[PDB]
Amino acid sequence: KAAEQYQGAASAVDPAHVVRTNGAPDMSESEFNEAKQIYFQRCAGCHGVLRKGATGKPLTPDITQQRGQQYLEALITYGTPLGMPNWGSSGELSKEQITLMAKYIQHTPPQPPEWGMPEMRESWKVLVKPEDRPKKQLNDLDLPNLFSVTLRDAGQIALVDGDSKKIVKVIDTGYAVHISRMSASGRYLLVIGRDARIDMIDLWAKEPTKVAEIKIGIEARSVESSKFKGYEDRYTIAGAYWPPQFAIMDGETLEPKQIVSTRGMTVDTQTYHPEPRVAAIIASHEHPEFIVNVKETGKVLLVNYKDIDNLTVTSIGAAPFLHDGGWDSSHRYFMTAANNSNKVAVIDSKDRRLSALVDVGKTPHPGRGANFVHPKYGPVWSTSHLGDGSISLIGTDPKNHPQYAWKKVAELQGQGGGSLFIKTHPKSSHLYVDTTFNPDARISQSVAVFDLKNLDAKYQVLPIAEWADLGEGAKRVVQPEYNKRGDEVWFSVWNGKNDSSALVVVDDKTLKLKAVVKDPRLITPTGKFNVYNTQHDVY
Amino acid sequence: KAAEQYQGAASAVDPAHVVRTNGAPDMSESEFNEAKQIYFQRCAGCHGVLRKGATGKPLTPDITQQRGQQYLEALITYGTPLGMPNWGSSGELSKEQITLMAKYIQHTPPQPPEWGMPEMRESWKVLVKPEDRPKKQLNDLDLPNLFSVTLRDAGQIALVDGDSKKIVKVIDTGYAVHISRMSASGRYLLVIGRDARIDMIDLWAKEPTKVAEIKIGIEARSVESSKFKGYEDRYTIAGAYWPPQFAIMDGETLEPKQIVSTRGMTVDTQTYHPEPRVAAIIASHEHPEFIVNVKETGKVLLVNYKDIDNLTVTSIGAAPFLHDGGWDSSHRYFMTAANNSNKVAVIDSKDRRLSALVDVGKTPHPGRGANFVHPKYGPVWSTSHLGDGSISLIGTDPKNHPQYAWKKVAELQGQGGGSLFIKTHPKSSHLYVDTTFNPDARISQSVAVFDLKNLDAKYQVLPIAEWADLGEGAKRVVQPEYNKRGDEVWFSVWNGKNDSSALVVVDDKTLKLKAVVKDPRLITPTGKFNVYNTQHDVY
Numbered sequence A, B: 001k002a003a004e005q006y007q008g009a010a011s012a013v014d015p016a017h018v019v020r021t022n023g024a025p026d027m028s029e030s031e032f033n034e035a036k037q038i039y040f041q042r043c044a045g046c047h048g049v050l051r052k053g054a055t056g057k058p059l060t061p062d063i064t065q066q067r068g069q070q071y072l073e074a075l076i077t078y079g080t081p082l083g084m085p086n087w088g089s090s091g092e093l094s095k096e097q098i099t100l101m102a103k104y105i106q107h108t109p110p111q112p113p114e115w116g117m118p119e120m121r122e123s124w125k126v127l128v129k130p131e132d133r134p135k136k137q138l139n140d141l142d143l144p145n146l147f148s149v150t151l152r153d154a155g156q157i158a159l160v161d162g163d164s165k166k167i168v169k170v171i172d173t174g175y176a177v178h179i180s181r182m183s184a185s186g187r188y189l190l191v192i193g194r195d196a197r198i199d200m201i202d203l204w205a206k207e208p209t210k211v212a213e214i215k216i217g218i219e220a221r222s223v224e225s226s227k228f229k230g231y232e233d234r235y236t237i238a239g240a241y242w243p244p245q246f247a248i249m250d251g252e253t254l255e256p257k258q259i260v261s262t263r264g265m266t267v268d269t270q271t272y273h274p275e276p277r278v279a280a281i282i283a284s285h286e287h288p289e290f291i292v293n294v295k296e297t298g299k300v301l302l303v304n305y306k307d308i309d310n311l312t313v314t315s316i317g318a319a320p321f322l323h324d325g326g327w328d329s330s331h332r333y334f335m336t337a338a339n340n341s342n343k344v345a346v347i348d349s350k351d352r353r354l355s356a357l358v359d360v361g362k363t364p365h366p367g368r369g370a371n372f373v374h375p376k377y378g379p380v381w382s383t384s385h386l387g388d389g390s391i392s393l394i395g396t397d398p399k400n401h402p403q404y405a406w407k408k409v410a411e412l413q414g415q416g417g418g419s420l421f422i423k424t425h426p427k428s429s430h431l432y433v434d435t436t437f438n439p440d441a442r443i444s445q446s447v448a449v450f451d452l453k454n455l456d457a458k459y460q461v462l463p464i465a466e467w468a469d470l471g472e473g474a475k476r477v478v479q480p481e482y483n484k485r486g487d488e489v490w491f492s493v494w495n496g497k498n499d500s501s502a503l504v505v506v507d508d509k510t511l512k513l514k515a516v517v518k519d520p521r522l523i524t525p526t527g528k529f530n531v532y533n534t535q536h537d538v539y
């Protein structure tokens, strides 16, 4: 009764400014569920789960009710030239569906479930206790030259022996695994599906088998291991798309320890954003931290694991829409692309600061990038683009080449836009770039190769898809990846699940076809990650 | 169109797990706003703006629709003995309104507006530029012994002269100012209304005037100034109840610099909490930081301002429901209370960690606390409670008294529960305790005073309200505050806006009535803050 009067004063909030939602077109339970079913299959990626706008404009009731029914239907139908697909013209969605979507986006967005520690512990499993795991490598596999290839639509990954070109094992994982990452010791393989299911695989057991797993969210893209000296296999971190968050777990058993929300203020307008999806994550070699990229808010956070109980985080403003990126040759600056901002943020991991924001081309997509010493400009880091066919070379040596540091020092020209990965290797004198999503078939089925010993000359075209001899299908080639020796470059010919695919190997020394890996179990192969190169960031 | 096919794959989110909210009893616009008004007038204080629950159970659709109309009405009607007021039995609400509330709480919680930089800058006003301000004290007031009193309902504060006992200047401010804090230089007076409006007052002007103002949110409770060596008047920070956030501004002009969301995972369950209100904030004397309390998640954040461009926060976990608190005698340990957890957290600001979690009585409400040297136990910090009449004494000397460090070393007994503040001074041998919200009028209209040179002896009751000679009204006495030289203790006779109030002063040496401050302008006086004691944390 004392506690009653103590909190018995009015809230400073003005009810007239608290807004009730509604005034949308009446639509039944089924009309709504069908619209909801379509929204995540076709729209959520670009517009966001909450519809506050990611790559695309906000689709919340305030704005959609203002536009009204007809503007909405027409827009969804014909699309626009700035990224909005023509769902009606292309005949991808019927007029009836487009009508339901126009009505759906006029209601309050349905709420997706949260996902904290209770759900994480319930999903967590230790398949083989640490004490029951091999003390030595119980097999004759050349682990360093192994490849962890993603069999996207099969919810599996494949361990392919680099020298023999044969599949050594197919392991069940999360659906469409996005990337593979190696532990600092080179013993454990870490794969994470887009569904946020992480699988830890012991490469030492008789046969590479799974020793632990967990689900850190409803949707995810990144996973990483602690690499600072004295912290081998200590912690594993993973970033989720929804909910906006990242989790730190034990690097031996994947036991969840800390969960941190990334919901916050943007760097540009400094207003509140409800869905800042976590993207790339890279382990720092300069301090005991993980370097996390928060997309929609454009913040690079340095999560310090020196004391995992009292988490110290340093919020660095970069630029909106941070995505992928990698280390420069020295492994001190984090070159990451803020793709929809057309800039490349450089994060100094030693001095823990933003070194610069470099203007590049339309929608940079470096992947992890390509590092090499330019004969004139010195040490550079490069990236290709999705929005155009240009290739940016950036200065990454402040000590010996300060006049070029953090500048778009030169530009190269590929086959065209739709590019996703650019590759190279220390031992190699070639530079490869794919064009996976280029709207042309001939271009999307081939890669461009440049001569680093003569960058003035144009690129040669390698007909990767044609070399694979597969037959029908889009046969989109993607992500060049070298072997440990650096004399073989691998490519994935990403064909439909009901079609036939392959991994095409090329002799880097001669640019001649070396081999083609086919197998009924090689369903929709995407990411290939050579152990050594992924473990030691060789790119 | 490359970017279009690039984001064409489906979201990992399951359409079936995204839910539409509704099936709530129909209610017209008029009915919905009548209830929505009542909700923020009477319920949001304890249940929260989004109704996820604070001191009370969550009132969200998933739960309320399960209970149904009958349960809800019956509960709102009679309440519960565990803190939920009997809205119907008391005659406070009608059967018609109660029926409206039971319906309202079965609907989706309406959404309050956000409040970022655009809104803050829009409200930010610099009344007198730093260049046009005085260079020295232009008045002849004894500033250190001045008193900043809250004229709550009047939306103002009065500067009362400690020695003359007269009102020197009444200043217009935000509604129901909660607290007053002094800048490090003792020059500027910082005050903040519950509506989140902050006013900076220069005590050097011929007549104290406001030099800047800003609104940092929809509703708030705290403000603080940087007190680390070399950062006098450098930064001002404020915490907000809604939105869940805190803002850091320029300490000379109040220019908004950084805004940080406090929405996050909880310390106990580690699940997402959409509304973790910011409670107490105290400047660190050990490092250039602010120690912030995040109530619902039970997190103590150490925000370092050495570089406010790239903010560094250390998130220390304490216990659920952090509220108020204050420095131990040495100004190193932040003694804060997790009031609904019945504990007191000790945050070591030097080593930057949770020293301990001490169990206390029901609902500890220390205010800033009371520090004194116990004859047997050594240095102690005390607090009274709102749920019971006890006074817990906790040891605060881990260097010279390890036996009692962080232990509820002993208890004292006051008139009863409903206590809000306990007080003492280094030059004083008395310990005061108010009982502001105690349900018995006589008790709520007086204060208990113990003898620190004889703690075994029972307290003495001082008829503070009765001494004021005001007449009718509740006359709740509140917050014992000392003067510069610690020889008199002030009390606030907080009476209604239409009734008559006063400030009763006691001669600490004789426990006799010394003076009574009355003025037609002294409307609903609540908090009083002696400039010196507030600035130099003398408590």
Ligand code: DHE
Binding pocket: A045, A152, A176, A177, A178, A179, A221, A222, A223, A278, A279, A280, A281, A282, A323, A324, A325, A367, A368, A421, A478, A479, A526, A527, A528, B006, B007, B008, B009, B010
């Ligand atoms: C955040 C992120 C990373 C960086 C993680 C890291 O390094 O820590 C990444 C890396 C990658 C890498 C890493 C390669 C590397 O060399 O580092 C691969 C193989 C890859 C295959 C694909 N990604 Fe990726 N990818 C996304 C997210 C990401 N992609 C998307 O959100 C997007 C645009 C939409 C989607 O549907 O996922 C997208 C499209 C694709 C594809 O279409 C690919 C080709 C196939 C697929 O399964 O989705 N992305």
Ligand code: DHE
Binding pocket: A006, A007, A008, A009, A010, B045, B152, B176, B177, B178, B179, B221, B222, B223, B278, B279, B280, B281, B323, B324, B325, B367, B368, B478, B479, B526, B527, B528
């Ligand atoms: C977070 C918080 C602090 C700590 C501030 C700091 O140190 O930075 C505080 C301090 C305070 C202080 C500071 C005293 C001090 O010596 O530090 C005062 C005077 C005070 C007067 C009141 N407070 Fe307060 N108070 C709340 C919040 C807070 N009160 C509430 O949420 C609550 C429970 C309900 C409400 O309506 O605000 C509440 C009730 C009250 C009252 O009823 C008082 C007596 C009158 C009023 O205006 O609401 N609270």
Ligand code: HEC
Binding pocket: A038, A039, A042, A043, A044, A045, A046, A047, A055, A056, A057, A058, A059, A063, A064, A067, A072, A075, A076, A080, A081, A082, A083, A084, A085, A087, A101, A105, B003, B004, B005, B006, B007, B008
């Ligand atoms: C990315 C590959 C997209 C997908 C998939 C979908 N949309 Fe989109 N949309 C996208 C962009 C970049 C834009 C802006 C384009 C421009 O010219 O400005 C849009 C815009 C919309 C809008 C219009 C918003 C407005 O002006 O108020 C609507 C109504 C919209 N998009 C709807 C929508 C739906 C329902 C989709 C799935 C069936 C969908 N979009 C997919 C990018 C992309």
Ligand code: HEC
Binding pocket: A003, A004, A005, A007, A008, B038, B039, B042, B043, B044, B045, B046, B047, B055, B056, B057, B058, B059, B063, B064, B067, B072, B075, B076, B080, B081, B082, B083, B084, B085, B087, B101, B105
């Ligand atoms: C604090 C001073 C409160 C105010 C003001 C209001 N409520 Fe409350 N309520 C409070 C507590 C501490 C509890 C817990 C009761 C217990 O015995 O544990 C409650 C609970 C409710 C409930 C019941 C919820 C449930 O059990 O499902 C309802 C329906 C409820 N309160 C409604 C409500 C309304 C509409 C109020 C304002 C008009 C209101 N509460 C004020 C604390 C406080």
